[PDB]
């Protein structure tokens, strides 16, 4: 019975759903944090150790003990309280009793042809998920959408001070992600008590958390996204712990395909960034994009790729600072997402420029004649 061990491991997500029903119930503030977001912060704990992914058991052990204490003290309504948190305490106390290991002390770091194809495809995708393709791009995409295009003003700490500097300099790309989890956890904690308590209308572009559901409805989406990325990362981190460059090119069509699927941005990235700057220019047409366009001219009059490479750290700096300014101009938008895309792309090309670089004949007939 594989499901026996699968369900002995299945307790983190099982608790998550019960903490989702603990959310929007009991205490609008306390309950949500203590249960859901402290389990989400314990997720962050093991991720921030960068070595103890799903191994931290000390704090995860006392998470249960904290929840038992709450139930013992307190949790229609007497009965409601009881039933409701017993329902989650039942599951929690069960981990403490037995099988705490499979999820916390076991998954550690220390049919036929069609089905065969299916599982291979699962793993190639996950390889790209453990690649920068997912580790970063998709995460920051959703971040920008749910910060700039969504609740602005105070979510700058979740974007323009984080990803606007983490994208160019990838040294702190994972640290930034962990800090992000922590900060949006903090943001939901704060908006939990809305803002309508004795309002007497300090200034940071106060939008005020007036709705309940709708207002709590996006920050949690990116919190979960961080978690999902971390899951697929640590999955293949332990799958690697335990468990053609120009040669395929001249082979055939499959060879050409393979080469480029693996090495697009490697070579095309610079031409890409140039065209991404044009995209920003067109989806804005303001005075702010004259700056982007002026930089475009500068790096295009540098011709030889070696000269563009020494103008690249300054270009990436400009882009990052511009995203920050754009927020501080919207606080103290869709244009912000466009400048993010340009930043993301050019940042990846800065991480290639001075790093990684330092029948099919009929197809070649077309492009090459």
């Amino acid at each position: 019975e594989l499901v026996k061990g699968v369900y002995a491991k299945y307790w983190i997500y099982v608790c998550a759903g019960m903490f989702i029903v603990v959310s929007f119930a009991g205490r609008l503030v306390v309950y949500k944090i203590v249960y859901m977001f402290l389990f989400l912060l314990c997720l962050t704990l093991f991720q921030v150790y960068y070595s103890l992914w799903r191994k931290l058991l000390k704090a995860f052990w006392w998470l249960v003990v904290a929840y038992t204490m709450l139930v013992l003290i307190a949790v229609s309504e007497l009965f409601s309280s009881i039933l409701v948190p017993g329902f989650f305490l039942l599951a929690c106390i069960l981990q403490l009793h037995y099988f705490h290991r499979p999820f916390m002390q076991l998954t550690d770091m220390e049919l036929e042809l069609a089905a065969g194809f299916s599982d291979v495809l699962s793993r190639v995708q996950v390889f790209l998920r453990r690649l920068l393709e997912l580790h970063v791009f998709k995460l920051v995409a959703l971040y920008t959408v749910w910060v700039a295009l969504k609740e602005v003003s105070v979510m700058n700490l979740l974007l323009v001070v984080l990803w606007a500097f983490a994208l160019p300099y990838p040294r702190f790309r994972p640290m930034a992600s962990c800090l992000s989890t922590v900060w949006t956890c903090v943001i939901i904690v704060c908006k939990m008590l809305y803002q309508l308590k004795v309002v007497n209308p300090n200034w940071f572009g106060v939008r005020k958390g007036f709705p309940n559901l709708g207002y709590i409805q996006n920050h949690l989406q990116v919190l979960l996204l961080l978690v999902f990325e971390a899951i697929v990362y640590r999955r293949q981190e332990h799958y690697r712990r335990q468990h053609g460059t120009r040669q395929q090119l001249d082979q055939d069509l499959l060879g050409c395909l393979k080469y480029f699927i693996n090495f697009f941005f490697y070579k095309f990235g610079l031409e890409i960034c140039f065209l991404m700057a044009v995209n920003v220019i067109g989806q804005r047409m303001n005075f702010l994009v004259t700056l982007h366009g002026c930089w475009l001219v500068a790096i295009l009059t540098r011709r030889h790729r070696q000269a563009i490479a020494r103008l690249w750290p300054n270009y990436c700096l400009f882009l990052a600072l511009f995203l920050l300014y754009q927020y501080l101009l919207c606080l103290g938008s869709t244009n912000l997402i466009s400048d993010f895309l340009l930043l993301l792309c050019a940042s990846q090309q800065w991480q290639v420029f001075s790093a990684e670089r330092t029948y099919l004949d009929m197809l070649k007939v077309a492009v090459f004649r």
Binding site: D250, Y359, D361, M362, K364, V365, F368, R369
Partner: protein, 109 residues
């Protein structure tokens, strides 16, 4: 079957188009066979001129060479797809030969 009939007619068409381009085709065998190429891959060309003009009166013989670097290198994939692809190949050869007539047609159209 209707499909099978169309296939045969496509091959009939290729033949007719080749008959039209015949003279130009043979003029492109005494010249363009040792001219246009674009198949050499990898880096650059070592024996630059020997790898083109000196490779492999209207209808000449083996005055130059035989078929040393594969005469049928081009005719590999060309004849490989004798259906479909070759119809369009024959079309191009016709309009390359009769480009003067193509111009005239366009201007009166």
């Amino acid at each position: 079957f209707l499909w099978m009939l169309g296939q045969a007619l496509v091959d009939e068409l290729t033949r007719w188009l080749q008959e039209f381009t015949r003279h130009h085709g043979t003029m492109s065998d005494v010249l363009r066979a040792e001219r246009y190429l674009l198949t050499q891959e990898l880096l650059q060309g070592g024996e630059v001129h020997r790898g083109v003009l000196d490779q492999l009166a209207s209808e000449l013989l083996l005055d130059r060479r035989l078929r040393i670097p594969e005469l049928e290198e081009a005719e590999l994939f060309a004849e490989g797809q004798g259906r479909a692809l070759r119809l369009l190949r024959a079309v191009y050869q016709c309009v390359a030969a009769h480009s003067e007539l193509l111009c005239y047609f366009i201007i009166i159209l």
